[PDB]
Design a protein around this ligand. Structure first.
Ligand code: MG
Lengths: 1083, 121, 120, 120, 120
């Protein structure tokens, strides 16, 4: 039996697990330190790449062997990213036939590495160890030709004593690395399969007698005032006879030093345990990351450890941190970079943390394996909470109790070794609050046993495994955790007394354009007991940088390396792009995670609530702004004293206000620089309407001309000619000073390009009929009506699915055009993606301005991060390049927008609002292409004016719908807007006056017999040029009896019947809210 | 002597003389009789056997008074049942030993309620 | 049935001493033995509605308590609950009262808690 | 209402001592504190019938007891009575159980009295 | 037991104007007094932490009071405007086995009971 096919064998020849000492981070300087006696083995290694293990040249490990003709590879790296073999992406399925513990012998990518190294003479009066930080997925070791042993777990280190087999001067290190092993069956994460020596290597030496391991814990008193320190030291003798001096020095965050321990110790293998008291220590948090330092010296052996005073506990189901309720505002993060793969640098690790904090995130979940030691250090130093997670996932093996690898005896010691090698390595980091047993790896005895071991070893941190809690309550965890639960579930949890707090380890799936209804989750978390937050899935899109045929860069996903089978773009689940460029959805996270809450008491008076745990608002620079029709007119700084929890009032003197629309913004920013952001960085803001605007209506006295011919109606007003087709009932062309403004007709449009969420819930199949109804339509009827100052052009159109749609254009003397749309859906049609018009203008029109939410794209269920203001952009930067092109660019709650070719402006106002988007390509283009690179060049701009477009959703991306309250259900709907083509931008508050009343008749039986039923008929005529939407209320004897909702299109009568029941003998008053009354007798 | 890490009374010294050979542990099991085997008790009530050997410590605190000290230990158990254990030591060298057991909504009947510990022969 | 421990709350205590002689089994250390209690409801309601009477029971003492909380209306025994409070723990109860007619009505327990309730 | 003595049973005791000094109010004379109880019923009955559970409570102690007698059926709380037994006095209670289906049923109290009942 | 929430219900008065004091009473007599000041604007709630001593089998009761810091047109320094009390710990009750005897003498009209130097 092969060692790489045997699950019971977990390693050979490897040292026991211990805490991290190398490299050290110095909290005072923020520089990395190494030991004196230290040789890096990073750099170039002779490298040979084979298809399997049995296509390797014999005797490749022997000194004598000649490798001169081999290729050179750089360490550390994943060899897929250097050229060799191909990367493979699979979600759940294994990339080989599943039959554990067996792996293929024909297709199993192998990599041999050779390298000579020089050991100094003075090293051999000392003990010498070779340290691999991480290899994937199995390897053998040879030194100077001899076999030392092997190791299996991909994301925890391997350490070998060599003092016996290593000579002064030149020594040979030979490493064989297999891609797939028994170990692979527990590494079935949703990610790329890579291989190779992808973390550092290095040699170091220690005295014969030395400190092997250190465990430092801390407790705090009931008041969280005083501390204790609990110190375990484990010593190890390897042939030392003389006694050595042990010294243990504490260093404070200030810098002061105290000797705790100074004693002589006879050389032996023993564990020494101390307890110290410490008065009013400085407590570590994510807000205030105060670190202490333990300096340990035994003879000439010196080591340093960074710890922080901080206590995590549960009281009556509630999750406390240093005595305060804690809310996990978290994200999942894959150790992934587009150019290097898993081999991620410190520079990029610092970029990530700073970006997170800048967007109000306080927690990271190492999905789903331990990271490089340096990550946890940097979380200690900058201040992030961590959920550390063992490298166990067996999704591809069924979770049935008989089948699952969690309940097989032969996989026991494997499960145990992966968890134990995470805990022992990380136990000292204050940032780590929760141990996680794995991810999607079933439930059984194998996890039960390993859990109980953790708790007896470390009592200071809470255990978490979704795998068990998905099947209900589980004794061996401390936290109830579910993935992508719907609201109902959260509310159910909260409804009864609970001993355990509820945490969503994954929620709000960010695949493509997503993260809908975030605020709606947090509105429930903050209100109801036992709910303490969660972690978004996920931080970064796993796209590989690649070049196409022409040589233009694109982000590559599953099936862009001839890799079959593959799960396409299901690895592209980020809130940032691969190069850390934010996706609009990040700006919604920041707004929903912010730690200040502001409530409007009165127009002038506002109540600020401080939701930090350990920070006074006095640390922040307060400002307020007022905006008149979107422009600032007043700004004023202020400071406000508020302790954690407190509410304080803020008075704002308001100016006298004209008929314009006023909006107040209140923000908080950093008074001075911090390690993670500059002075003036904004950490929280909130807006409020002060005054709605006064809308003008202007009687137009100027005329309008009308010329009919066979195939065209033509309507002239001022210096603008509108051309309608009698044969397509569409506005085809607008001439403005003999200059063409349209490149394709103005057409009703019901579709949007399917997002990743939409594809997941089969939207394209379910709502197909609305796509067809966006392209095809029968013209049923078409008429016009002139008046002294205006001409109306009506077009009635039936649509696939048998839905009617009315379109009315009114042109006024002053060259304004009102554009109305009613839509009457058919009794058996499904929900509507979008309501609005679509048309194309020349590309010349290259600059857009608008008064609305901005600056970035918002949608119906993700627009809290939109600040109302005036904005200006080029058309090119009015979309967002999603790795898989999708719906993008929408602006919400817009008053007005204008396109500009320099001279001519195409202006559009709402009545009183619209949603819009501009593209430099067709919808058809955007639906077709699957990569950013393939987006064509076009001599035109597509414009979308829309009543509304359905929410994005994303509670998951494999069936979940947008919440009911963001879906256009099939009922009657109307919608209008004003358009003008002029050299300047006219006042959005001024409009052409039109009549606004309906004609109404009521009619019934003036009498009836006791018991009978009264039938009240209502005719409603709409002669006016706009769609009406009315609530017809029937009163009996003064009391509200019934109500109907109607939508009358222009030039149309609507008839209603109400049925009245229960009238007793005598006379009875029937009246409406449309000035119609009638006495009814009951014989 | 109490353990902060196992929330169990581990040792009693009486004039520097060890009285315990293993900690005082809650115990819910009994060794199946011939009748028990006949009605499948070992299968039906397995979860109470596991809950006699394994337990997570959720919480642990103490409270001194002039004449006494109380040591509380909250423990969740296989089947998701909670069990509270309170030791009060008095000046006169008496110790009161209390146990509550709150079973989970879907656990079967209990064989036994009580403590177990070992002393020298 | 009458020899089976069905899954409900259960408490249990005993005294242990390690000494050269055997002490009197009848003598024990004194400890406090009372619970803190608060009752609370809507002081009023509309004929037909339902009255919700909430009870908080704190146990500061070093032993498990086992109590029978009885709710009286207008002197007559209306309902009872069985509780088991562990040491250093509060327990909350809700009772639902139904059928109160117009007029004032006496709500009291067997834990020295009383309250007049009006029915509009 | 919640400050009136309505007509129901009531008990009440105190200690008195005539001495030259004031003794500790916390220290009292020990006395027995238990009741003797018996439970009895029809070991069986026909589906639809009514089970009649009889309880005797003898008080041989020198103080009046106030007890909440609770009846359980199949481990669920069915009914509760409030009693006041004066010294050197037996009280008798009868409970009526209704709606027992075919099959065996566990009748028990909070006074350590149990009994399997059959329903033909 | 150690933590207490103070709420200022004056319209136009800061609680800083008053002298705070807390006292602990063992079986009625006091054993510990301390003075304190607390800053709280109209409406505000503020926490107050009180270190507690180790407590024997006696009955403990806290009293928290506010008084006038200096004289006013209507009253003298020290005058108490507000106080509240709380049970800290209930007492442990002793029960003592009595070994000593009691005589009894019956006659036509009297029963006589002798114990120590008291006849009933
Ligand atoms: Mg995304």
């Amino acid at each position: 039996p092969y060692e790489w096919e045997n699950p019971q064998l977990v390693s050979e020849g490897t040292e026991k697990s211990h805490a991290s000492f190398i490299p050290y981070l110095d909290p005072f300087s923020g520089e990395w330190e190494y030991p004196e006696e230290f040789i890096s083995l990073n750099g170039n290694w002779r490298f040979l790449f084979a298809k399997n293990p049995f296509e390797v040249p014999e005797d490749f490990f022997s000194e004598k062997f000649d490798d001169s003709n081999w290729d050179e590879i750089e360490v550390p790296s994943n060899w897929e990213m250097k050229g060799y073999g191909k990367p493979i992406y699979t979600n759940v399925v294994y990339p080989f036939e599943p039959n554990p513990p067996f792996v293929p012998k024909d297709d199993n990518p192998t990599g041999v590495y050779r390298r000579w190294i020089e050991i100094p003479e003075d090293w051999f009066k000392k003990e010498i160890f070779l340290h691999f930080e991480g290899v994937r997925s199995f390897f053998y070791l040879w030194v100077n030709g001899k076999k030392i042993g092997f190791s299996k777990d991909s994301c925890t280190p391997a350490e070998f004593r060599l003092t016996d087999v290593l000579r002064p001067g030149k020594n040979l290190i030979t490493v064989e690395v297999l891609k797939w092993s028994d170990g692979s069956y527990l590494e079935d994460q949703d990610m790329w399969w890579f291989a190779g020596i992808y973390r550092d290597v290095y040699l170091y030496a220690l005295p014969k007698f030395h400190i092997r391991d250190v465990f430092v814990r801390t407790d705090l008193d009931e008041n969280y005032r005083n501390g204790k320190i609990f110190l375990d030291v484990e010593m190890r003798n390897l042939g030392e006879e003389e006694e050595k001096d042990l010294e243990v020095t504490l260093i404070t965050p200030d810098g002061d030093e105290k000797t705790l321990v100074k004693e002589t110790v006879k050389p032996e293998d023993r564990v020494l345990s101390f307890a110290f008291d410490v008065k009013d220590p400085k407590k570590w948090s994510a807000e205030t990351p105060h670190l202490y330092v333990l300096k340990l010296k035994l003879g000439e052996d010196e080591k340093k450890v960074n710890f922080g005073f901080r206590k995590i506990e549960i009281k009556d189901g509630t999750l406390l941190f240093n005595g305060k309720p804690l809310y996990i505002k978290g994200v999942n993060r894959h150790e992934f970079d587009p150019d290097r793969g898993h081999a991620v640098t410190v520079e990029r690790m610092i970029q990530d943390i700073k970006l997170m904090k800048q967007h109000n995130i306080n927690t990271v979940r190492t999905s789903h394996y331990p990271n490089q030691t340096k990550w946890y250090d940097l979380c200690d130093y900058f201040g992030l909470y961590v959920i550390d997670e063992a490298n166990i996932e067996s999704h591809g093996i069924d979770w049935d109790p008989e089948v699952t690898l969690a309940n097989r005896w032969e996989w026991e010691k494997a499960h145990f070794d992966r968890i134990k090698r995470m805990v022992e390595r990380d136990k000292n980091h204050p940032s780590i609050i929760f141990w996680s047993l794995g991810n999607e790896a079933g439930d059984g005895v194998n996890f039960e046993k390993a859990a109980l071991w953790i708790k007896k070893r470390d009592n200071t941190r809470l255990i978490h495994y979704e795998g068990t809690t998905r099947r209900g309550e589980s004794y061996y965890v401390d936290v109830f955790s579910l993935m992508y639960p719907k609201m109902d579930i959260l509310l159910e949890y909260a409804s009864k007394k609970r001993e355990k707090p509820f945490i969503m380890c994954e929620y709000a799936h960010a695949m493509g354009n997503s993260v809908g209804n975030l605020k709606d989750y947090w509105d429930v978390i903050e209100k109801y007991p036992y709910l303490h937050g969660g972690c978004i899935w996920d931080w970064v899109d796993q796209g590989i940088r690649k070049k196409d045929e022409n040589g233009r860069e694109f982000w590559a996903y599953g099936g862009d390396f001839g890799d079959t089978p593959n799960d396409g773009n299901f690895c592209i689940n980020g809130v940032v792009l691969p190069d850390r460029t934010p996706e609009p959805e990040l700006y919604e996270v920041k707004k929903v995670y912010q730690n200040v809450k502001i409530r409007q008491v009165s127009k002038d008076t506002y109540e600020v609530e401080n939701r930090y745990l350990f920070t006074n608002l006095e640390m922040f620079d307060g400002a307020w702004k007022i905006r008149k029709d979107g422009e600032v007119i007043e700004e004023k700084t202020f400071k406000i004293f508020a302790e954690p929890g407190e509410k304080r009032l803020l008075k704002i003197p308001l100016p006298e206000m004209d008929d314009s629309e006023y909006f107040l913004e209140i923000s908080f920013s950093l008074s001075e620089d911090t390690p993670w952001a500059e002075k003036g960085h904004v950490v929280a803001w909130e807006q409020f309407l002060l005054k709605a605007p006064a809308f003008e209506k202007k009687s137009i006295s100027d005329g309008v001309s009308l010329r009919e011919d066979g195939k065209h109606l033509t309507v002239e007003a001022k210096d603008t000619v509108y051309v309608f087709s009698k044969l397509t009932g569409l506005l085809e062309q607008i001439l403005h000073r003999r200059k063409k403004i349209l490149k394709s007709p103005v057409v009703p449009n019901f579709w949007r390009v399917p997002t990743d969420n939409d594809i997941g819930n089969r939207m394209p199949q379910r709502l197909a009929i609305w796509k067809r109804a966006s392209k095809e339509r029968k013209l049923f009827k078409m008429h016009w009506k002139k008046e002294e100052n205006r001409v109306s052009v009506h077009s009635v159109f039936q649509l696939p699915g048998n839905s009617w749609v009315y379109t009315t254009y009114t042109v006024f003397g002053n060259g304004d055009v009102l554009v109305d749309l009613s839509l009457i859906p058919a009794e058996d049609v499904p929900e509507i993606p979008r309501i609005g018009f679509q048309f194309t203008v020349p590309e010349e029109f290259g600059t857009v301005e608008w008064y609305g939410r901005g600056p970035h794209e918002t949608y119906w269920d993700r627009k809290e991060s939109g600040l109302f203001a005036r904005y200006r952009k080029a058309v090119g930067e009015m979309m967002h390049r999603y790795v898989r092109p999708q719906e993008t660019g929408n602006r919400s709650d817009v008053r007005w927008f204008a396109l500009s070719d320099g001279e001519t402006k195409l202006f559009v106002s709402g009545m009183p609002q619209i949603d819009f988007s501009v593209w430099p390509f067709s919808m058809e283009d955007l639906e077709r292409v699957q990569h950013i690179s393939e987006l064509p060049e076009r001599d035109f701009v597509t414009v979308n004016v829309d009543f509304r477009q359905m929410g994005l959703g994303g509670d998951d991306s494999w069936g979940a719908m947008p919440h009911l309250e963001y879906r256009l259900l099939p009922k009657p709907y109307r919608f209008s807007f004003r358009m003008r083509i002029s050299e300047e931008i006219p006042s959005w508050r001024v409009l052409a006056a039109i009549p606004e009343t309906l004609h109404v008749e009521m009619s019934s039986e003036d009498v009836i017999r006791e018991g009978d039923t009264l039938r009240v008929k209502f005719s409603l005529l709409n002669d006016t040029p706009l769609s009406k939407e009315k609530q017809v209320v029937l009163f009996v004897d003064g009391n509200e009896y019934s109500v109907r909702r109607v939508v009358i299109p222009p030039f149309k009568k609507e008839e209603l019947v109400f049925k009245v029941e229960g009238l007793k003998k005598g006379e009875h008053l029937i009246h409406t809210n449309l000035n119609t009354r009638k006495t009814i007798y009951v014989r």
